[PDB]
Amino acid sequence: MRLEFSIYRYNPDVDDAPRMQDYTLEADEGRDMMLLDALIQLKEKDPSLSFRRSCREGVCGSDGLNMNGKNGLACITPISALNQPGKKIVIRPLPGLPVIRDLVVDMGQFYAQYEKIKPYLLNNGQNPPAREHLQMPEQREKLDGLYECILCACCSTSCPSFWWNPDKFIGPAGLLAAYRFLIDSRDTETDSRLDGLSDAFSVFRCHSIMNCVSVCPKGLNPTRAIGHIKSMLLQRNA
Amino acid sequence: SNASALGRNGVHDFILVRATAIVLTLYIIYMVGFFATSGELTYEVWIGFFASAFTKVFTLLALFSILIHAWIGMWQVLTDYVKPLALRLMLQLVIVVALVVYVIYGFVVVWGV
Amino acid sequence: MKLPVREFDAVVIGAGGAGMRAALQISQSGQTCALLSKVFPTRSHTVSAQGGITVALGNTHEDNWEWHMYDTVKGSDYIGDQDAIEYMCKTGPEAILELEHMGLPFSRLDDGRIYQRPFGGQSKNFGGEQAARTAAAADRTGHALLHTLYQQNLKNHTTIFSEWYALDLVKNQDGAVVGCTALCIETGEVVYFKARATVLATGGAGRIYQSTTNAHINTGDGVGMAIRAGVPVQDMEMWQFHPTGIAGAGVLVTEGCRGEGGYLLNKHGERFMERYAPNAKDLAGRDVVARSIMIEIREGRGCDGPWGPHAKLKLDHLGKEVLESRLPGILELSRTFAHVDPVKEPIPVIPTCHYMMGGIPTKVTGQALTVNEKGEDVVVPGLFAVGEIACVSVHGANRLGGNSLLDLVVFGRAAGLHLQESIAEQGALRDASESDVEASLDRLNRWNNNRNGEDPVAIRKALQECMQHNFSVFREGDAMAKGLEQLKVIRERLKNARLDDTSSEFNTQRVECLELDNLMETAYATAVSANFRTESRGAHSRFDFPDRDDENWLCHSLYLPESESMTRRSVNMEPKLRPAFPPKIRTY
Amino acid sequence: MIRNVKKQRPVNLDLQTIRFPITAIASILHRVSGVITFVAVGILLWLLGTSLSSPEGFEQASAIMGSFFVKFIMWGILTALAYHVVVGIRHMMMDFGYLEETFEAGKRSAKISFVITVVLSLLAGVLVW
Ligand SMILES: CCCCCCCCCCCCCCC(O)O[C@H](COC(O)CCCCC)COP(=O)(O)OC[C@H](O)COP(=O)(O)OC[C@@H](COC(O)CCCCCCCCCCCC)O[C@H](O)CCCCCCCCCCCCCC
Ligand SMILES: *Cc1cc2c(cc1C)nc1c(=O)[nH]c(=O)nc-1n2C[C@H](O)[C@H](O)[C@H](O)COP(=O)(O)OP(=O)(O)OC[C@H]1O[C@@H](n2cnc3c(N)ncnc32)[C@H](O)[C@@H]1O
Ligand code: HEM
Ligand SMILES: CCCCCC(C)c1cc([N+](=O)[O-])cc([N+](=O)[O-])c1O
Ligand SMILES: O=C([O-])CC(=O)C(=O)O
Ligand code: SF4
Ligand code: F3S
Ligand code: FES
Ligand SMILES: [Ca+2]
Ligand SMILES: [Ca+2]
């Protein structure tokens, strides 16, 4: 059928303030397509419309966008889920972050917090393994749901606490990642890591709102991981 | 360690809030259970309920718990919305003084009954 | 002199699997280095890798690197260098275990329904190996590897220029590569990155087809920059079409399925792969297993439906548990794209474009080579290549499964470990006149002043179509012939193509356009090559020449650029090594 | 734009543009309820003050509570307070572990909470009367 789209537009050198632009992409009513598909077509009609995209299969994290008020990946959000007769399909950039152009936001602050938590293994080197490290399936199982994060930023972009303290509160993604190392048998700085997170913002700004779990493409659960971090903190600081 | 935050650190704040929450929930139940077992409240019944060592001591433990709890609480809120330093400090000052006065007035009211 | 300059002792163009493994190694060596990328590093195609990394570790069962050489040489069709392969397979373990010490989320061994063994990287059964030597961490081995690697560049504080578009390389008066030029996608500014070493790691470009497993990013910018500069490309017709791509989707599904015990069946219920490769079964080589299913479609005996003429990749028989534990990434891409839960129904799979075996010819040390007047290998000063953009001649004419990732790390690291030595060798390289630098800015200037030209979409669309039909799994002279000409037509067409967006703040169009040129030069070389070869080898299958020419075509077809001037085609080869190795019969 | 330095990028932050789960509503009300209750205590202390000062005082308080306008306010205070306790307890439970941290488990907690709140709110109204 026909499709009425509502898309966020902005260009520092032409516009001085954002505006929502009307789009009509008459598509074949054959089957369902992803929102990325639409955009790519619309961009043929209109070149100026810019947005990020790549793996195209829900695995790179590039196409994070707020669709009809909810964050998700354009590469895997079916037009079915977003089509309602008479009403338009509102597509906007991820909330809170600064807008570089059209639907492209500066992800800077996002990556920052990620680094703050030391996203890499830390092994004092004491007791070197002959070959690889000793990791029993049961120990490795603990990483599941903590290493598949794609840094799409749908989560952090949906959290009010992160809107207010972009640089103080680490945010869902960053905490999920912190936990990934806190419970890695291979990592030997877990107590050092916990001391680094004991301030008032890093971790405790999380109010268990659960919007992060709500929108995670990979179905990850940062709230739960943050809850475990908090527990470690109590074990170590009380 | 943030100067306005009661807690020395995060975890400290986490605990203080949860401990006072608990103490305050008991107290509330205590006060509720009384009113739901009163019906028509006479001046004799009212003052009788407070002239009680137990009620005095609980009421003051509550107020004191409120200072700690509402302090950490209002603090977290101000940290989110009042970004201009000068303004926020004024508020915290107004708030903490208020909380302290709540407790002081509590003592004054209690020994006076 | 109005163009900005950024001097580095190195410039690694590409943040893919190999691009980062190198940037990391080059940095460990106390060398100043800038790492560039079109997207955020964690977004490179590598993140999408599934299967795993095939290296002889001996975990799953005792093994030696030589079996890895035999399994592989026969896999390439004795078109892949014994010197290079040897080095890769041998240096395999150490290099991989290196990654585990970096924190790579490998799967582990010990208890399983009917299995049991210690903490080793879990090695899965895979295509082209007698037994299971594929180190895999769930279905997402690439995502694991890429991310670990990025976390590493974070630790060692590597200088990263994210979302910068490299245009064309800059040549020295003496004909050396001395850096490159690039576009800051964010702001739009153009800059010349001057370097004593310029490493290309721009991955493949399967985007020259209509149905590929690659990402919208794989436009072989690398290939285009090498040709437009004067650097050749080896075996640029050798393209591996993956056996189990999703019908109608073009989205990949791991070979590990067959590895965990997956069936590749036909509508008549038979396992045609058992009949094609009578003893090797579904484990049969890449090139081979493709034509099998593709053939069942030629005879009108291929399964059909909404998705299209597919083959059934039955897995449901395996436990829903095993599928969720071992292939979680598969159970979702199927549902999401194929609308079929593998736990209960087979998957609409079809051979689709996958790995590009061809690319810039290089020594094990990652250095780039061109032929001499006589036709002798001559290294190119200031230029190196690693990853998929490079034909070190390891996969030859058929890339064994899970070896590409093994390639990335090994030669990626090989390039780094050897950089300082290589610079010493080429010695000093002189500056570039604004002329040299100005030259590279040509492609860019063109697009920006031309606005009344032709709409790129069509040119792009056509480009892909032609390649799809004339250079598919099976091809023939008459075909290439036609396409080879259509291409010329299009290549001229593309010269008048226009650019609608002339903005600065993140111009997706400008970038896609500039990538088109590469799509063009890439597809082109691909063709002139495909046509040229008179034999049916690995992925190359001509109905006109059904057998492999051992005496005539046992060599690397070198595409001979002259930038945009008129082309040429030559040859190359590598039989010597340490333990020795003979050509033979190739029955999978 | 500071003095002689321009352009500050825009931000998507129109709340009417963002769709908020029930769980997000649940917690923000907990925050609001808290600030209401902060103020509430003062008011209640004042009343308690009058109430106990003397007989004439207890009379003056009994009558203030007579105003139906006042009855409405004394009613919200207790409802706000009630909301806050319930959601607070819900909060503390997930913390420890008497509630799943899954999203579904989360919406269920939230819903049951509002229900108990409404009920207590009704009871509060019966008392104010
Ligand atoms: C598990 C979690 C626990 C929940 C926690 C949540 C708590 C908040 C929710 C509040 C719920 C309250 C529920 C009350 C209740 O149950 O009412 C009951 C109703 O039960 C039914 O309807 C039966 C149905 C059964 C179905 C199964 C009993 O009500 P009655 O029938 O007696 O009705 C009054 C009557 O008309 C007859 O009324 P009256 O004529 O006697 O009234 C007189 C009127 C005026 O008297 C005065 O002037 C004295 C005022 C004294 C005020 C003292 C304030 C104390 C402040 C302390 C602060 C300490 C820091 O009296 C008023 O109407 C009485 C108002 C009482 C308000 C009490 C508020 C509780 C405050 C607790 C402390 C707060 C802490 C803040 C940090
Ligand atoms: C597509 C695919 C491939 C794949 C696989 C699954 C899929 C869906 N599973 C594999 C597996 O299990 N085992 C294996 O051995 N290989 C597997 N493959 C193939 C493999 O992923 C590739 O060979 C490999 O990823 C290539 O890595 P490389 O690092 O060489 O390339 P890349 O990851 O594609 O990244 C290229 C980088 O270069 C940047 N770039 C490109 N052009 C430019 C310009 N002009 N300027 C600046 N940077 C540029 C990219 O942005 C990217 O960072
Ligand atoms: C004396 C009456 C009370 C007042 C004035 C009060 C005030 C506050 C304030 C201002 C906050 C912080 C707002 C926020 O950041 O969300 C808060 C949070 C909280 N309160 Fe209370 N409170 C009171 C009673 C209670 C009681 C009785 C409980 C126990 C059920 C409780 C449990 C909690 C919890 C768990 C939080 C944490 C919310 C978060 O971290 O987001 N409160 N309170
Ligand atoms: C009067 C309250 C206004 C709240 C506005 C916004 C955007 C908000 C929304 C949620 N939420 O959970 O949906 C949480 C917080 N908050 O400060 O915790 C928050 O500030
Ligand atoms: O390219 C390969 O190595 C095969 C692969 O990833 C897969 O089958 O998933
Ligand atoms: S946890 Fe989920 S939503 Fe959050 S950044 Fe990672 S993939 Fe994105
Ligand atoms: S939404 Fe934000 S407040 Fe916590 S529960 Fe998720 S990180
Ligand atoms: S394009 Fe990568 S997940 Fe959407
Ligand atoms: Ca530890
Ligand atoms: Ca290659």
In angstroms, the CA C189 to CA C487 distance is 32
Classify strands C377-385 and C5-8 as parallel, antiparallel or unpaired: unpaired
In the numeric block, the tokens 């169009």 are attached to C509
Q: Does B14 touch chain A if contact means CB atoms closer than 8 Å? A: yes
In angstroms, the CA A186 to CA A168 distance is 28
Selection from A217, A119, A108 nearest residue A166 by Cα: A108
Whether ligand 1 lies within 6 angstroms of the CB of B62 is answered as yes
C107: chain A residues, CB-CB within 8 Å = 137, 140
Helices D103-128 and D68-96: angle between axes, nearest 10 degrees? 150
Amino acid at C423: I
**Cβ proximity of C171 and C229 under 8 Å:** yes
**Cβ proximity of C100 and A133 under 8 Å:** yes
Q: How many whole angstroms from A55 Cα to the centroid of ligand 9?
A: 34
Structure tokens at B45: 């019944």
The residue segments making up the domain with residue B75 are 9-113
Q: How many whole angstroms from B38 Cα to the centroid of ligand 1?
A: 9
Q: Report the length, in residues, of chain D.
A: 129
Query: What's the number of domains chain A is made of?
Result: 2
In angstroms, the CA C206 to CA C522 distance is 10
**Cβ proximity of C337 and C330 under 8 Å:** no
B contact set with D (CB within 8 A): 18, 21, 25, 28, 35-36, 41, 43, 46-47, 50, 66, 70, 73-74, 77, 95, 98, 102, 105-106, 109, 112-113
In angstroms, the CA B18 to CA C175 distance is 72
Catalytic, C286? Answer yes
Selection from C15, D122, C215 nearest residue A57 by Cα: C215
Task: Name all chains with 3 or more CB-CB pairs below 8 Å to chain B.
Answer: A, D
Q: Please indicate, yes or no, if residue B43 is contained in any of the structural domains.
A: yes
Strand partners of residue C184: C164
Residues 6 or more apart whose CB falls under 8 angstroms from that of B21 comprise B69, D88, D89, D92
CB-CB under 8 Å, A208 with D94? yes
Structure tokens at C576: 């010597």
The residue segments making up the domain with residue D93 are 1-129
In angstroms, the CA C125 to CA C123 distance is 7
D41: chain B residues, CB-CB within 8 Å = 66, 70, 102
Q: What is the H or E stretch that residue C459 is in?
A: helix C456-470
Selection from D88, D92, C83, C286 nearest residue A227 by Cα: D92
C197 HSE (CA, 13 A, CB side): 32
Strand partners of residue C212: C353
In angstroms, the CA C220 to CA A110 distance is 30
From first CA to last CA, the distance across chain A in angstroms is 62
Q: What is the resolution of this structure in A?
A: 2.9
Q: Does D98 touch chain A if contact means CB atoms closer than 8 Å? A: no
**Cβ proximity of D90 and D23 under 8 Å:** no
In the numeric block, the tokens 């226009």 are attached to C498
CA-to-CA separations, C568 to C232, C308, C525, C530, C554, in angstroms, rounded: 10, 39, 10, 13, 19
In the numeric block, the tokens 């709110």 are attached to D121
| Residue ranges of E strands in C97-249 | 123-124, 134-135, 159-161, 164-171, 177-184, 190-195, 198-200, 233-234, 239-246
Q: What is the H or E stretch that residue B107 is in?
A: helix B85-111
**Cβ proximity of A74 and A93 under 8 Å:** no
Selection from B107, B95, B106, B101 nearest residue B70 by Cα: B95
Residue A86 and residue A112 share a domain: no
The residue segments making up the domain with residue A203 are 107-238
Amino acid at C546: P
Q: How many CB atoms lie within 10 A of CB B29?
A: 11
Residue A169 and residue A219 share a domain: yes
Helices D22-53 and D55-64: angle between axes, nearest 10 degrees? 150
Nearest-CA residue for ligand 7 atom 3 is A206
Classify strands C377-385 and C198-200 as parallel, antiparallel or unpaired: parallel
For residue D124, the domain's CATH number is 1.20.1300.10
DSSP one-letter string for C134-150: EE-STT-HHHHHHHHHH
Q: Please indicate, yes or no, if residue B46 is contained in any of the structural domains.
A: yes
CA D88 to chain centre: 10
In angstroms, the CA A55 to CA C40 distance is 12
Method of elucidation: X-ray
Facing B47 at nearest CB: one of D31, D52, D88: D52
Selection from C171, C209, C258, C218 nearest residue C46 by Cα: C218
For residue A95, the domain's CATH number is 3.10.20.30
CB-CB under 8 Å, B105 with D52? no
Selection from C229, C301, C232 nearest residue C269 by Cα: C301
Question: 3-class DSSP state for residue A7?
Answer: strand
In angstroms, the CA C245 to CA C2 distance is 49
Q: What is the H or E stretch that residue D75 is in?
A: helix D68-96
Residue A81 and residue A124 share a domain: no
**Cβ proximity of C569 and C59 under 8 Å:** no
In angstroms, the CA C161 to CA C313 distance is 42
In angstroms, the CA C249 to CA C308 distance is 10
Query: What's the number of domains chain D is made of?
Result: 1
In angstroms, the CA C418 to CA D61 distance is 89
* Proportion of chain D in helix, strand, coil states, percent, rounded to 5: 80, 0, 20
Which listed residue (C207, C258, C286, C443) is catalytic? C286
Torsion of Cα atoms, C59 then C64 then C67 then C68, to 10°: 70
- CA–CA–CA angle D41, B7, A210 (5° rounding): 80
From first CA to last CA, the distance across chain B in angstroms is 41
In angstroms, the CA A211 to CA A154 distance is 9
**Cβ proximity of A93 and A66 under 8 Å:** yes
Q: Does A198 touch chain B if contact means CB atoms closer than 8 Å? A: yes
Classify strands C347-356 and C360-361 as parallel, antiparallel or unpaired: unpaired
Q: How are strands ordered across the β-sheet holding A64-67? A: A19-24, A4-9, A89-92, A64-67, A70-73
**Cβ proximity of C355 and C204 under 8 Å:** yes
**Distance (Å) from the alpha carbon of A107 to chain B's nearest alpha carbon:** 21
Backbone angles phi, psi at C53, to 5 degrees: -120, 115
In angstroms, the CA C297 to CA C300 distance is 5
**Cβ proximity of A120 and A176 under 8 Å:** no
In angstroms, the CA C148 to CA C137 distance is 12
Selection from C549, C432, C14 nearest residue C194 by Cα: C432
Classify strands C263-265 and C311-314 as parallel, antiparallel or unpaired: antiparallel
Q: Please indicate, yes or no, if residue B1 is contained in any of the structural domains.
A: no
Ligand 3, closest atom to CA B22?
Answer: 29
Residue A6 and residue A58 share a domain: yes
Q: Does D12 touch chain A if contact means CB atoms closer than 8 Å? A: yes
Considering just the CA atoms, what is the radius of gyration of chain D in Å? 21
Q: What is the 3-state secondary structure (H, E, C) of A37-89?
A: HHHHHHHHHCCCCCCCCCCCCCCCCCCEEEECCEEEECCCCECCCCCCCCCCE
Strand partners of residue C347: C313
CA-to-CA separations, D99 to A204, C348, D37, in angstroms, rounded: 19, 42, 26
Q: Please indicate, yes or no, if residue B86 is contained in any of the structural domains.
A: yes
In angstroms, the CA B92 to CA B89 distance is 5
Residue A93 and residue A34 share a domain: yes
Nearest-CA residue for ligand 6 atom 8 is A152
Domains in chain C, CATH or no CATH each = 1-245+351-430 (3.50.50.60), 246-350 (3.90.700.10), 431-547 (1.20.58.100), 548-588 (4.10.80.40)
Residue A237 and residue A122 share a domain: yes
DSSP state of D37: H
Backbone angles phi, psi at C550, to 5 degrees: -65, -40
Q: How many whole angstroms from A167 Cα to the centroid of ligand 4?
A: 18
Structure tokens at C421: 């030595």
Question: 3-class DSSP state for residue C379?
Answer: strand
Q: What is the H or E stretch that residue C23 is in?
A: helix C17-28
For residue A145, the domain's CATH number is 1.10.1060.10
Selection from C265, C395, C257, C378 nearest residue C328 by Cα: C257
Alpha helices (H) in C494-565, listed in sequence order = 508-532
Q: Does D17 touch chain A if contact means CB atoms closer than 8 Å? A: yes
B112 HSE (CA, 13 A, CB side): 13
**Cβ proximity of C201 and C412 under 8 Å:** yes
Residues 6 or more apart whose CB falls under 8 angstroms from that of C446 comprise none
From first CA to last CA, the distance across chain C in angstroms is 60
* Plot region of C6 (φ>0 → left; ψ -120 to 50 → alpha; else → beta): beta
CA-to-CA separations, A186 to A109, A194, C265, C311, C361, in angstroms, rounded: 29, 16, 42, 42, 39
Residues 6 or more apart whose CB falls under 8 angstroms from that of C550 comprise C583
Residue A172 and residue A142 share a domain: yes
DSSP one-letter string for C256-286: HHHHTT-EEE-TTS--HHHHHSTTTGGG--H
Q: What is the 3-state secondary structure (H, E, C) of B48-93?
A: HHHCCHHHHHHHHHHHHHHHHHHHHHHHHHHHHHCCCHHHHHHHHH
Q: Report the length, in residues, of chain C.
A: 588
Backbone angles phi, psi at D8, to 5 degrees: -120, 115
Judge whether B12 is annotated as a binding position.
no
Q: Please indicate, yes or no, if residue B93 is contained in any of the structural domains.
A: yes
In angstroms, the CA C148 to CA C142 distance is 10
**Cβ proximity of A102 and A49 under 8 Å:** yes
